[PDB]
Amino acid sequence: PSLLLSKRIIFLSSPIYPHISEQIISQLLYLEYESKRKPIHLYINSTGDIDNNKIINLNGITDVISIVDVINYISSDVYTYCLGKAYGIACILASSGKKGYRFSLKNSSFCLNQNKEIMNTKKKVIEIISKNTEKDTNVISNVLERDKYFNADEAVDFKLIDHILEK
Amino acid sequence: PSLLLSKRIIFLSSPIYPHISEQIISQLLYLEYESKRKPIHLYINSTGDIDNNKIINLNGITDVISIVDVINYISSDVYTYCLGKAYGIACILASSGKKGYRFSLKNSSFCLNQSYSIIPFNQATNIEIQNKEIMNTKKKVIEIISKNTEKDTNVISNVLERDKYFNADEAVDFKLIDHILEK
Amino acid sequence: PSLLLSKRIIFLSSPIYPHISEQIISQLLYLEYESKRKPIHLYINSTGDIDNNKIINLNGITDVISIVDVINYISSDVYTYCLGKAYGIACILASSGKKGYRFSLKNSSFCLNQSEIQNKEIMNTKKKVIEIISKNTEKDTNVISNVLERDKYFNADEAVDFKLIDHILEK
Amino acid sequence: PSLLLSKRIIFLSSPIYPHISEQIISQLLYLEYESKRKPIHLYINSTGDIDNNKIINLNGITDVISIVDVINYISSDVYTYCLGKAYGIACILASSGKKGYRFSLKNSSFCLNIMNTKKKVIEIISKNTEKDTNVISNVLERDKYFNADEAVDFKLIDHILEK
Amino acid sequence: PSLLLSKRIIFLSSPIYPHISEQIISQLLYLEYESKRKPIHLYINSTGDIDNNKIINLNGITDVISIVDVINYISSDVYTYCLGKAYGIACILASSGKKGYRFSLKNSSFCLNQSYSIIPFNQATNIEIQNKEIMNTKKKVIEIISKNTEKDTNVISNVLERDKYFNADEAVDFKLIDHILEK
Amino acid sequence: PSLLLSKRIIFLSSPIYPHISEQIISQLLYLEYESKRKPIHLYINSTGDIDNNKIINLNGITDVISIVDVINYISSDVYTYCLGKAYGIACILASSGKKGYRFSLKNSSFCLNQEIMNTKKKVIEIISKNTEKDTNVISNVLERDKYFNADEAVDFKLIDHILEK
Amino acid sequence: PSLLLSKRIIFLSSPIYPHISEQIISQLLYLEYESKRKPIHLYINSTGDIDNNKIINLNGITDVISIVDVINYISSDVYTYCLGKAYGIACILASSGKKGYRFSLKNSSFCLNIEIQNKEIMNTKKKVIEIISKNTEKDTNVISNVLERDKYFNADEAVDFKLIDHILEK
């Protein structure tokens, strides 16, 4: 709760509900104001915007776009640690941590899932994943037409994640 | 909450419901009383007075007119930061920050709605008073946007006959916003 | 909330529901007991006893009479600040602040509404509302009685001229 | 709630519901145990046991009796202040404050409305107003409304607040 | 609430519901543990186990026997104070305070109800067991009232055959209450 | 609640529903970790797993067994106090308190009821250990419902003292 | 609740529902940051991922694998205590506690139970054997063989099998 904040830790351990992305942003903002260039630890154990076959956030993809935008804006490096699951927008979130400081446990799981606004958002999500994984917007666009699950090792190979944690 | 308040941050992160506009004004007054000429950081990620095609605030326009009025009275400069969306009355609010200190993130969107008035279900007893108020409100919102963007009321009145969407760059060009935030 | 209370600020930011006038009196009493002759800042953005034209307080007029009565009783001065709207009973309230210290924002609006057993009380209530507005505006009971025969809408400038309000706040 | 209590204030600002008379007694008790002979300030703005023709307390009369009996019991004086309205049982309560210390605002209003209950209510008012049980009983058969000044002459109220 | 508890006060201000007798005991135990031999003030304004006219606690009598038992158990004296009504089991409760310290207000009322027992019939309602329990409860209630009033079990048994109402003065003579009120 | 917990008191004042045994163990463990060798006061007023003829807990017997197993693990002694009723599994719980420190009020009532074979052996065994009797003699009495008043429970060695004054 | 947390105690007292494995990880992380190298007490009374013959967590196995991962991650030792039942994935959990500090009460019980299936299930089964093998200091073959049959252990049999280290007593 506040004890984790005093140590610059944010734990996402639920589906990203509308109030959750608000809380992540609020906490990121607070921490940046507390100390300018001091690492922030974002622990992730989430199924993203979905929860038992139901989308629990009508604005999930745009919410995560906002979070990664503030992550890019603030001077504090945010490290990511996957503690079990990082699916959908949570996987995007995980891969958005500072390059070289995106971590995962050995057995964690990862997954990637008027009219004009829908397409602009789709281009924005592709650009982030492409930038994070160091791959062309062409090759990432193609993989997102199906659902792909990575294990921790497969996530390191794909450059979603950098290192696997050990004690 | 109060933790954001301790840093002089007001974070609008929802549609501007009746109670939200009350909270913004309350926090503005509170911060101004706590410290006199000290910048206030208004972060905005809002769809204004609409939420899923439904109007969630019948008094949205006057509420935001009220907010920008208190922003203009208090000695503390308020900087605005768009964190994703600033639509309708939230766009007016964003552009109302101190000139030079209206910021936006890379992927943020802004929208100005085609000029509109909402008549609540309940009949106003004085129709003549209500009609004059609808006109003054329509006049004030054009006046605020015209001032914020440094444009004539003719061009702003003209552009409020259609819905207009802005990316950050287009918002900087239209003078709704000053700078796009980077590392 | 209690955060505003610590700065001796009362913020009326809604139609005056029954519980609202109760809170205003409660807070005025509390602040008076907390510090004796220290100013109280009453900020007002209210459409009075109607909420979007729907009547939400049957005792609106008698409520505000009590509030202005406690304001006149307590030793602490109350300054009033109109943040957008002050309609009907909210207008009476705004004008009841200490003379010289009744403020309003540039775009604020004001409105004075049209006017044995209960029958005697109704005429008494009308006499009091005239008497308060007469005293607040420095006008005779006859000229105020005549003006309340119809609705009168005010902008900030028109409110200053009528002496409902003293100053328009500017940075 | 607790903020007014810390200043030894009890503020009856609604019709006297069943839970209200309980809260008034609870606070009266707490305050007496908190400080022995320190005055208590009972502020009243109430229409009694009636709220728009609907009687909101079947025990309204017996409840206020318990409160006044609690008032006469405790060592702390209670000062009453009418802040707008005090009708029916709320008028009885207001008049039950320590004699000399029953106050009212300028524009305040007052009103007065098996067999054992009827005698007790007539008796308390008679004691409060310093009048015969006969003259009070005779005038209680008609609903009578007092303004602040009229309340002082009848001795329901001692002073009208100013300054 | 916790405010009255800080002053060693328990205020029974309602019918004795099933959960209420649990709350009385918990507060008795808590206060006893807070200070060992320091008086507890039980204020009573209760109509017992009935509320115009429904029985609101099917186990009312056994509940009050529990309360008086813990009252007899704890080292702390409990003084009783009747603040209006103490009917039925609340009258037994009121009379159970330490002798010399059972108090009442001037206009207070007391009542002891006439009695009968209505026993439901299910699939496993043993007549030998339930009738014997009804017998012990009746013996305990008379025994408690007998001790409290310092009267014979015979005269107390006889008085419970009819309804008896008391004012404050009548209760002191009957040894339910010790003292009236004072300035 | 936490108010009773602050004084090392656990007050069971209801039937032992599925959720109750989970709560008692939680409070026992908390108090043990709060202070190591400090008596816990278990006040009991319960009809066991039966509320008005109807069974309110299918795992009543196994649930109460887990509680006593915890009582025989933690270093803090638990004193039991019967506040009116300790029927069936509640009687087992009451008798499971520290020897010499099982109390009852004057007017209290106790009762004993008339994988499956393995559990029934433990229930006979625990009572035998609690009452200092052979599993043989206790097995004999559990063929019928036996109700105790306070005095009879003391003689039977379910309870140690009757608290008074 | 947080009252047990203040004493560094996590009390698993139900089937491991999806939110339960979620709460355990939350609590382990919290305790680790609250005090860095200070023992955590994981009390277990659980039927694992089954309740009344119904599966209550489809990801029960991967969840407990992830929990053992956080246990292996944090600097704080976690002591385990079986308070009655530790079946299936709950048994894996109990045996995953610090060696020498896996405890049980006397009367406690223990039990070990195309495109989508081909690589997901067979990988999971290999991990489950590998963990139990490490915990019990036994080869993967004897564990793979013992897992083909439903096997129950009492406290004594659990100690001999090296699932549990000590049987605690007052």
Q: Which amino acid is at B101?
A: Y
Q: Which of F90, F116, F114 has the alpha carbon at shortest distance from F104?
A: F90
Whether A97 and A41 have beta carbons less than 8 Å apart is answered as: no
Distance CA E170, CA E162 (A): 16
Q: Say how many residues make up chain C.
A: 171
Cβ of E7 within 8 Å of Cβ of D22? The answer is no
Q: Who's near B166: CB < 8 A, 6+ residues apart?
A: B109, B110, B111, B174, B176
Q: Who's near E181: CB < 8 A, 6+ residues apart?
A: D69, D72, D73, E103, E104, E105, E106
Cβ-based contacts under 8 A for chains E and F:
51
Does residue C33 belong to the interface with chain B, where contact is any CB pair within 8 Å?
A: no
Q: Does domain F1-165 have CATH number 1.10.150.120?
A: no
**Which SS3 state, helix, strand or coil, does residue B35 take?**
coil
Does residue A14 belong to the interface with chain G, where contact is any CB pair within 8 Å?
A: yes
Cβ of F107 within 8 Å of Cβ of E140? The answer is yes
Within 13 A of D69's CA, how many CA atoms are on the CB side?
25
Interior angle at CA B23, CA B17 and CA B29, nearest 5 = 145
Which residues in chain E have Cβ-Cβ distances shorter than 8 Å to F13?
22, 25-26
Query: Which residue bears the tokens 């103490």?
Result: E86
The fold of C1-171 is 2-enoyl-CoA Hydratase; Chain A, domain 1 (3.90.226)
Q: Which of D12, D45, D111 to mutate to test the interface with C (most CBs of C within 10 A)?
A: D45
Q: Which of C16, C70, C128 to mutate to test the interface with D (most CBs of D within 10 A)?
A: C70
Q: Which amino acid is at F148?
A: F
> How many other C-beta atoms are found inside a 10 Å radius of the C-beta of residue G119?
10
For the record, the structure tokens of C17 come out as: 């529901």
**Which SS3 state, helix, strand or coil, does residue D124 take?**
helix
**Which SS3 state, helix, strand or coil, does residue F112 take?**
strand
User: What b/e sequence results for D66-103 when a residue is b if at least 16 CB atoms lie within 10 Å of its CB, and e otherwise?
Assistant: bbbbbbbbbebbbbbbbbbbbbbbbbbbbbbbeeeebb
For the record, the structure tokens of G92 come out as: 């894996």
Which residues in chain E have Cβ-Cβ distances shorter than 8 Å to F84?
62, 65-66, 69
Q: Who's near C44: CB < 8 A, 6+ residues apart?
A: C12, C80, C81, C82, C83, C86, C90, C93, C94
Ranges of beta strands (E only) in A31-167 are 40-46, 78-87, 102-104, 109-112, 148-151, 163-164
| Sign of CA pseudo-dihedral A29, A33, A37, A39 | negative
- Give the resolution in Å: 2.8
Cβ of C128 within 8 Å of Cβ of D105? The answer is no
Query: Which residue bears the tokens 């659980």?
Result: G46
H or E, element range at E86 = strand E78-87
For the record, the structure tokens of D81 come out as: 């202040």
Task: Name the neighbours of D, counting chains with at least 3 Cβ pairs within 8 A.
Answer: C, E
Q: Which of E181, E160, E164, E29 has the alpha carbon at shortest distance from E107?
A: E181
Residue G83, classified by CB atoms within 10 Å of its CB into exposed (0-12), middle (13-18) or buried (19+), is buried
Kindly give the pairing relationship between strand B78-87 and strand B102-104.
parallel
A3, A45, A165: residue with CB nearest G25: A45
Q: Which of F70, F87, F99 has the alpha carbon at shortest distance from F10?
A: F70
Task: Name the neighbours of A, counting chains with at least 3 Cβ pairs within 8 A.
Answer: B, G
H or E, element range at C67 = helix C60-73
DSSP state of C98: P
Which residues in chain F have Cβ-Cβ distances shorter than 8 Å to G13?
22, 25-26
Cβ of F7 within 8 Å of Cβ of E25? The answer is no
Greatest alpha-carbon span in chain E = 59
**DSSP one-letter string for E3-64:** HHHTTTEEEE-S---HHHHHHHHHHHHHHHHHSTT--EEEEEEE-TTEETTEES-TTHHHHH
**Which SS3 state, helix, strand or coil, does residue C159 take?**
helix
Which residues in chain B have Cβ-Cβ distances shorter than 8 Å to A75?
183
Kindly give the pairing relationship between strand G50-51 and strand G54-55.
antiparallel
Whether F73 and F110 have beta carbons less than 8 Å apart is answered as: no
Cβ of E33 within 8 Å of Cβ of F9? The answer is yes
B7, B14, B45: residue with CB nearest A66: B45
Q: Which amino acid is at B14?
A: S
Q: Which of G81, B148, D10 has the alpha carbon at shortest distance from F74?
A: G81
Q: How far is C-alpha G160 from the chain's CA centre? A: 18
Whether F155 and F131 have beta carbons less than 8 Å apart is answered as: no
Q: Which of D31, D73, D116 to mutate to test the interface with E (most CBs of E within 10 A)?
A: D73
CATH architecture of A1-167: Alpha-Beta Complex (3.90)
Whether E141 and E68 have beta carbons less than 8 Å apart is answered as: no
For the record, the structure tokens of B54 come out as: 């439904």
Interior angle at CA C161, CA C158 and CA C164, nearest 5 = 85
Q: Which of A103, A105, A154 to mutate to test the interface with G (most CBs of G within 10 A)?
A: A105
Domain at G1-170, CATH class: alpha beta
Cβ-based contacts under 8 A for chains A and G:
47
Whether A10 and A40 have beta carbons less than 8 Å apart is answered as: yes
Distance CA D134, CA C18 (A): 39
Convert C110-134 into a string of H (helix), E (strand) and C (coil). Answer: EEECCCCCHHHHHHHHHHHHHHHHH
> How many other C-beta atoms are found inside a 10 Å radius of the C-beta of residue A55?
12
| Sign of CA pseudo-dihedral B125, B126, B129, B135 | positive
DSSP state of F98: P
Query: Which residue bears the tokens 């922003």?
Result: B71
For the record, the structure tokens of D149 come out as: 């000044």
Cβ of F25 within 8 Å of Cβ of G13? The answer is yes
Whether A95 and A160 have beta carbons less than 8 Å apart is answered as: yes
> How many other C-beta atoms are found inside a 10 Å radius of the C-beta of residue C117?
8
Distances (CA, A) of B66 to B35, B74, C39, D100, E78: 21, 13, 24, 48, 60
Whether F107 and F84 have beta carbons less than 8 Å apart is answered as: yes
Q: Which amino acid is at E63?
A: D
Peptide bond into D116 cis (omega under 30): no
Distance CA D107, CA C70 (A): 10
**DSSP one-letter string for B45-107:** EE-TTEETTEES-TTHHHHHHHHHHHHHHSSS-EEEEEEEEEETHHHHHHTTSPTT-EEE-TT
Q: Which of G125, G117, G67, G76 has the alpha carbon at shortest distance from G94?
A: G67
Within 13 A of F78's CA, how many CA atoms are on the CB side?
28
In the beta sheet, which residues pair with residue D160? D104
Query: Which residue bears the tokens 């989430």?
Result: A46
Helical ranges in G74-109 per DSSP H = 89-95
Does residue G107 belong to the interface with chain F, where contact is any CB pair within 8 Å?
A: yes
Q: How close does chain A come to B34, measured CA to CA in Å?
A: 18
Query: Which residue bears the tokens 């106050």?
Result: D103
G1, G4, G83: residue with CB nearest F70: G83
CATH architecture of E1-183: Alpha-Beta Complex (3.90)
Chain G residue at shortest CA distance from F122: G107
Q: How close does chain C come to D4, measured CA to CA in Å?
A: 6
The backbone region for D48, taken as left when phi is positive above 0, alpha when psi lies in -120 to 50, beta otherwise, is: left
Does residue C111 belong to the interface with chain B, where contact is any CB pair within 8 Å?
A: yes
Q: For chain A, what is the radius of gyration of the CA atoms? A: 15
Q: For chain G, what is the radius of gyration of the CA atoms? A: 15
Cβ of F33 within 8 Å of Cβ of G7? The answer is yes
Ranges of beta strands (E only) in D28-152 are 40-46, 50-51, 54-55, 78-87, 102-104, 109-112, 144-147
Taking chain A, what is the end-to-end CA distance rounded to the nearest angstrom? Answer: 23
Convert B119-176 into a string of H (helix), E (strand) and C (coil). Answer: CCCCCCCCHHHHHHHHHHHHHHHHHHHHHHHCCCHHHHHHHCCCCEEEEHHHHHHCCC
Q: Which amino acid is at E57?
A: N
Q: Which of A111, A113, A107 has the alpha carbon at shortest distance from A152?
A: A107
Does residue D33 belong to the interface with chain C, where contact is any CB pair within 8 Å?
A: no
Q: How close does chain C come to D106, measured CA to CA in Å?
A: 7
Q: The domain D1-163 belongs to what CATH superfamily?
A: 2-enoyl-CoA Hydratase; Chain A, domain 1 (3.90.226.10)
Distance CA D11, CA B150 (A): 54
Chains D+A touching (3+ CB pairs under 8 Å): no
Distance CA C64, CA C25 (A): 10
The backbone region for G48, taken as left when phi is positive above 0, alpha when psi lies in -120 to 50, beta otherwise, is: left
Q: Who's near C139: CB < 8 A, 6+ residues apart?
A: C163
Chain G residue at shortest CA distance from F98: G170
Chain C residue at shortest CA distance from B73: C171
Q: Say how many residues make up chain E.
A: 183
Experimental method: X-ray
Whether G76 and G113 have beta carbons less than 8 Å apart is answered as: no
Q: Which of F127, F80, F133, F129 has the alpha carbon at shortest distance from F108?
A: F80
Convert E154-180 into a string of H (helix), E (strand) and C (coil). Answer: HHHHHHCCCCEEEEHHHHHHCCCCCEC
DSSP state of F117: H
Distance CA B110, CA F144 (A): 81
Cβ of A69 within 8 Å of Cβ of B106? The answer is yes
Distance CA F152, CA C97 (A): 78
Whether D79 and D38 have beta carbons less than 8 Å apart is answered as: no
